[PDB]
Amino acid sequence: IAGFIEGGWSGMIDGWYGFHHSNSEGTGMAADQKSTQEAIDKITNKVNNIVDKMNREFEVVNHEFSEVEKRINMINDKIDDQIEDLWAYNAELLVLLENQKTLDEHDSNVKNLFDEVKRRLSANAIDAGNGCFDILHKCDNECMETIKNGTYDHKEYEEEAKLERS
Amino acid sequence: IAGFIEGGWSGMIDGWYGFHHSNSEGTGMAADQKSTQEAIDKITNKVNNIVDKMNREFEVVNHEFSEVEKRINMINDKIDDQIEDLWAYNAELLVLLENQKTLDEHDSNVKNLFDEVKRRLSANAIDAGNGCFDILHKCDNECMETIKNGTYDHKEYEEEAKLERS
Amino acid sequence: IAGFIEGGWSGMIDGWYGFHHSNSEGTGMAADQKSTQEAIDKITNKVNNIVDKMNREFEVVNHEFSEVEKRINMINDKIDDQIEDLWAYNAELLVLLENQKTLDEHDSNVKNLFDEVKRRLSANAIDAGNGCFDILHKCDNECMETIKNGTYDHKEYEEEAKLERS
Amino acid sequence: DRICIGYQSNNSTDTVNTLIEQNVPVTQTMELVETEKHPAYCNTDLGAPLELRDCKIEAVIYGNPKCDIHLKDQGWSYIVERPSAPEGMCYPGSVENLEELRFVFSSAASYKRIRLFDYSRWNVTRSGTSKACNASTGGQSFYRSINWLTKKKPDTYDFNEGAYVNNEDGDIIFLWGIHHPPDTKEQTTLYKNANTLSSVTTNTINRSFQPNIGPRPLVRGQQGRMDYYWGILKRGETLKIRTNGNLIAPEFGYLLKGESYGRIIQNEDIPIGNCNTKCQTYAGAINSSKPFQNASRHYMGECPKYVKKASLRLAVGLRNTPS
Amino acid sequence: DRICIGYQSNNSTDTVNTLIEQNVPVTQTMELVETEKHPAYCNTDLGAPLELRDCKIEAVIYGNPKCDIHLKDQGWSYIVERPSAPEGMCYPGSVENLEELRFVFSSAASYKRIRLFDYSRWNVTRSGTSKACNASTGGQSFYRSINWLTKKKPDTYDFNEGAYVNNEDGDIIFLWGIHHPPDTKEQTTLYKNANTLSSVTTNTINRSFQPNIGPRPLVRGQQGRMDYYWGILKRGETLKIRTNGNLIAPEFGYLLKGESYGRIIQNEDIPIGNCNTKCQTYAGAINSSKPFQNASRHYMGECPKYVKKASLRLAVGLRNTPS
Amino acid sequence: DRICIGYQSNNSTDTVNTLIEQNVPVTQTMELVETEKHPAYCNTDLGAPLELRDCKIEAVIYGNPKCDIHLKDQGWSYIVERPSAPEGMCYPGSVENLEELRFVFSSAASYKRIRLFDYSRWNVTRSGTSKACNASTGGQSFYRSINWLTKKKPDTYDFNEGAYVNNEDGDIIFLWGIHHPPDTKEQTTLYKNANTLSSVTTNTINRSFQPNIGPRPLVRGQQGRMDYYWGILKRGETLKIRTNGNLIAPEFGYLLKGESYGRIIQNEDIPIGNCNTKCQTYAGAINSSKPFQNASRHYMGECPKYVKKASLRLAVGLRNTPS
């Protein structure tokens, strides 16, 4: 089994980021709900700012001009044309910019979750591979669920020390 | 003692980023002035660009119209209304965007300082923990002050090699 | 020989990022064409978006007014002044923002190339130094070119294991 | 024993553009440009549109007798004027400050037609009619809002004058005209005096007119012309009129409440709908939830800004790259 | 032995908003919206405001005799006109292109009042007065800038004409009026001729007027009316006037230096201050250091852009998260 | 044995500014402000400019006889009017709606001069001339487009009238004038009648004029004045004129195809060039590849937006930091 370096998981249906473990009892795939919730809250804020800061107060009617008011006719059209150019360009570039940042933010949340687990595992696992730790001790299904909920010590420190010189 | 992973230091009063060491002579907390000054110069530039690139040249008086000049009255108001919507939206979004980038820039400056010290220490320390190196040798207050000002070699290469197999 | 931590390479003329190796046969310096092309494609997209989304449809003539048309003269001038202030500020800030991101994107592409090589090298090299791996086995010019094109396994796992306890 | 960190992929076919990449697959997106519209003119916060199929706004205001149009006391939030509407100023001539008049009639929070004068009381013959201004039933008629005065029979037209005081709940729009006959014989048979003075005055308005006799090109059977005018009589003010001929005198004014906002839609084929909307564009009604819309640069109500783009997809989910 | 890398926390209570998070505590911020204002009208780079408490701009220009206002020779940077000011055109009637006239008087880098004609020299009786235009002392008076000419006694009003050449250091604003009496008896007693021609001409201006006799609604005791007009006599140009009645003739013009910019503030309760500012908004003076301000959409000087927001806090320091 | 990852440095001296740093060396940049211009007025998509060195637009339209300017049947994309051009309306007086007239003449996709009336057929003496309107050869002359009619000799000026029907492929601009003589003797010798009525009418236009006799200040030898006017005769419409004196009657109209866009460049020292451009600014022609330009805020064609900046360098390559 591989982590995020080798691509996304179609199995995970309950969240955006999470965990896939394998021990002698078999394998488990669950979303990490607190890194997913964080990311959902942030993207929700982003969307609400882009949508809700827009003012919907002013009206644009089609004004009428006589044939001897050509100049003010053009001035009116210039306001509309120049304002529309400002909105067309800024709205395109805003979305292009923020789309690039959103996809980088997801990548960065995944690497933050990985690094939070490398700090919990410490010398008890080899960081080698593919978004994946190889744990040097027997890690049963409640050892696993403590690596995930954060309640995990280095109890095992010396069961790994022996396995590591092997 | 813990580094940046476990939160910020109220003790540090002379800068934004720095060092907390502990040896047998006791502990020392000092700002790294070089990484602090860099960040201050950068944020100063950012602020100066946002404030100083604004033009303060043009005036907005309240024009007067007769009761048979309703159309040009509305055109005048349309300029003011649409321009104001543009500034309101861009100024909000600019500050939101830049505020997010500033806090990420601080986090990244801290991690750059950490990584600059892991490269000088190399095999002489275990990177393990919480923004903190565990040094495998004799390193008194003058060895410390060399890890901080950068003038620190791998003199100690095998005093730790012994300490690392234990 | 040093990697990217110690500065840029004037020798490299065929690309933006790449490889400098040293073995018993001597040294080799070549661009990595696949990380370079990616980066060029991205910067090209950025530039095309900034240049091509600008609309070049509307015209700005110098309108004429009588001496009893001072108000509409000033209204016309207000459109041009306020529109011009919006473009001056947004175009400066856009370029300042995007220049900062472009230079960060280059640093991040380099770091990505490094991390893609540390993952292929695994326990077979010491990550220590300056953007540079010290490989623990004899890696001749055809081993090297496999570290570069991705076609490299850990055949060598046990030749390093002995060299590493030395 | 092994623990792996990963992210989700799904079956989305959504893509987005970013500043550096075209068409990146992502696990979910949202659209920022409102591109769907209900192709009809609906009610807005201010109420229902007034549709003008056969009459231009000037015609219903001056009361072209072919214009049956219902002006309702509720008023109207905007006017949909069909460009093909044939009926305008039936007796040839043009309206001074026409665009400003149309503008003041384009919205009304409520509406009341007010009698300003009764020409029973005047030493003139009243209610002249014309073949240029036929009723819908068929006979010759005239505008409803202004009254064609000619000399009292057999041959007297002295200076007549009258006054109306605005005691109503707001400003009144009133209308008048000046008839220019094609020759001196017509001038004398209609008005007796060879030259006349017609004055329309208020507390603030001070206007006088004299006829300019002469033939103009034939229009709708006519070589004479009318100049049409209008004014605003503010609350409490007095409207005085005086004429010894050629005045087409004000008879009905209009009390409109509300400010006007130039809400005139010049459109042929979009119909009046049975619908309500916060945002009525000139191309149809739209939801206003999204920040942009590509329906039309012209709109009324609480509306997203116009952009001429087919789509602006914002990334929400992840880069969709399954292993 | 151990070395740790860390960052600072402090006692700041500052928060900012970011695109992805609300109310993030940070070690220091700075405000981008100027929200503090000195609630007074101050001097700017162009100098002091002119305050008009009891007179409208038109009244001081035409010189309503109740209008004591001292226009000083230094001029003024802008006009604060109190909406409650009662005195306007004391003799009823309206000013053609009124908004443009007010516009040209709104700033002046300096001011000089110029005599254009001496009506001693004219074959008329000069300086008529009216109860509609009482002086502040109490007796009937008239405008200072324009002069009511009536027929020379006992009964002569021939065509009178005169010329003024602008030899001054600028363009001169001049003023005139045309009296419309309520009936032919008043016309003959004031002006003798039953109809008159008054011409006001310059090198470029070519204007003529005839009276329209008749009663208008009673205003300030009067059923007559005046139409008021104004013009610009450019440097070197000649102003010629000619009348055999009904002209209210130009007597004093105005030499204003500088261009005008429509700096008119229509405000009741903000006082004139003893203060100087780079930025004067219509709601008070403000510092211009910050890029935005929420005082007012209307302003003069070197001003930040208006935003209707209470605050825009920019992060400067770190996310404030102590260990 | 060792493998190193690196990035390129080069001999570039380019720097850019970023939000956080001034003057960062980078291996490659590109400029976003177009700062190079060809200092000439070129052809654009709509064709060649019309240069007016000696005549203002009004003079060529009315046909000042010193203005030989060749108006080409191809038309013109814009007008370059030299501010020093001396010749305007040779006979003193001003053009009503002058700015709107100049506007309609500023572009033409094609041009045709149309004869509207032949005054051979009229019971008047035609083609009066004046020393104020000298030909370029030297003798006294008059406008080409409007015709000075005076009484048929020895002493008859009855009401004359004529009609022109627009049977051409578009809208026709026509011109006329009204002469105001300085005294009743000049009025009677030129026109016989002491007062006259001149009417200019179309299907929609209804205008009448009477002379105002009197001396105005001397201009170019003259104490009389002309008021100049203009109108638009739409396709199919009829132009009727009627006068018993003082009408300076329309003789030649103009058929301009295309809409106008106010393309008038008021510039002294930039010459007409032999060049083509998509973007013509008022300061010269420019390439339009880049998104911004600092040549001028005024421009025509497909143009980058104006910014008043010397440069906007975008980073393309890497931070130039050699080892």
Ligand SMILES: *[C@@H]1O[C@H](CO[C@@H]2O[C@@H](C)[C@@H](O)[C@@H](O)[C@@H]2O)[C@@H](O[C@@H]2O[C@H](CO)[C@@H](O)[C@H](O)[C@H]2NC(C)=O)[C@H](O)[C@H]1NC(C)=O
């Ligand atoms: C205005 O209406 C007249 C009226 O025409 C007739 O009388 C009515 C009572 C009604 O029965 C109509 O249907 C009749 O046609 C129109 O004048 C007639 O127009 C026709 C058609 O051009 C013509 O043959 C007759 O000579 C006209 N008759 C008279 C007595 O003048 C007229 O066309 C209408 N005007 C407009 C502008 O539509």
Ligand SMILES: *[C@@H]1O[C@H](CO[C@@H]2O[C@@H](C)[C@@H](O)[C@@H](O)[C@@H]2O)[C@@H](O[C@@H]2O[C@H](CO)[C@@H](O)[C@H](O)[C@H]2NC(C)=O)[C@H](O)[C@H]1NC(C)=O
């Ligand atoms: C204009 O002033 C007249 C003059 O009023 C009187 O005479 C002055 C010398 C001074 O002493 C005033 O205080 C006097 O009142 C006003 O005319 C009188 O108005 C009062 C009040 O309405 C009225 O009872 C009298 O009939 C008027 N007298 C005459 C001789 O007409 C008038 O009110 C003033 N007009 C305006 C518009 O202010």
Ligand SMILES: *[C@@H]1O[C@H](CO[C@@H]2O[C@@H](C)[C@@H](O)[C@@H](O)[C@@H]2O)[C@@H](O[C@@H]2O[C@H](CO)[C@@H](O)[C@H](O)[C@H]2NC(C)=O)[C@H](O)[C@H]1NC(C)=O
């Ligand atoms: C309009 O032209 C007249 C005529 O000028 C003279 O006659 C021509 C045939 C030609 O030979 C010209 O070069 C001559 O100068 C001008 O009137 C004369 O102006 C001069 C110079 O100011 C003056 O001495 C004479 O008195 C004038 N003669 C007459 C008969 O009036 C006049 O200057 C021209 N007007 C304008 C506005 O240019």
Ligand SMILES: *[C@@H]1O[C@H](CO)[C@@H](O[C@@H]2O[C@H](CO)[C@@H](O)[C@H](O)[C@H]2NC(C)=O)[C@H](O)[C@H]1NC(C)=O
């Ligand atoms: C407004 O947006 C809509 C939504 O994309 C556009 O309608 C689509 O146009 C595309 C491209 O021309 C076509 O493939 C489809 O036929 C349209 N889809 C639907 C559902 O109508 C429309 O072109 C846009 N109009 C403007 C002016 O931007």
Ligand SMILES: *[C@@H]1O[C@H](CO)[C@@H](O[C@@H]2O[C@H](CO)[C@@H](O)[C@H](O)[C@H]2NC(C)=O)[C@H](O)[C@H]1NC(C)=O
């Ligand atoms: C302009 O900004 C100021 C500063 O935030 C606002 O004044 C505050 O208004 C808030 C909200 O109404 C109140 O809680 C405080 O009483 C005000 N503070 C002070 C110091 O006066 C003001 O509301 C803003 N005005 C606009 C139109 O945005």
Ligand SMILES: *[C@@H]1O[C@H](CO)[C@@H](O[C@@H]2O[C@H](CO)[C@@H](O)[C@H](O)[C@H]2NC(C)=O)[C@H](O)[C@H]1NC(C)=O
């Ligand atoms: C438009 O941009 C150009 C290009 O920078 C400017 O011309 C330069 O001006 C600088 C600053 O005065 C001088 O150092 C050089 O002499 C000019 N360079 C060249 C190649 O001519 C010009 O000043 C800019 N104008 C405006 C109004 O922004």
Ligand SMILES: *[C@@H]1O[C@H](CO)[C@@H](O)[C@H](O)[C@H]1NC(C)=O
């Ligand atoms: C009608 O004539 C009589 C004549 O004595 C007059 O009193 C009355 O005012 C006149 N009516 C109008 C409306 O002028």
Ligand SMILES: *[C@@H]1O[C@H](CO)[C@@H](O)[C@H](O)[C@H]1NC(C)=O
């Ligand atoms: C006054 O009358 C005499 C009468 O001959 C005349 O010469 C003079 O010009 C007149 N004054 C004015 C100002 O018209």
Ligand SMILES: *[C@@H]1O[C@H](CO)[C@@H](O)[C@H](O)[C@H]1NC(C)=O
């Ligand atoms: C010229 O006079 C005769 C007089 O009978 C008239 O028929 C004709 O219409 C007149 N010409 C013009 C142009 O008015």
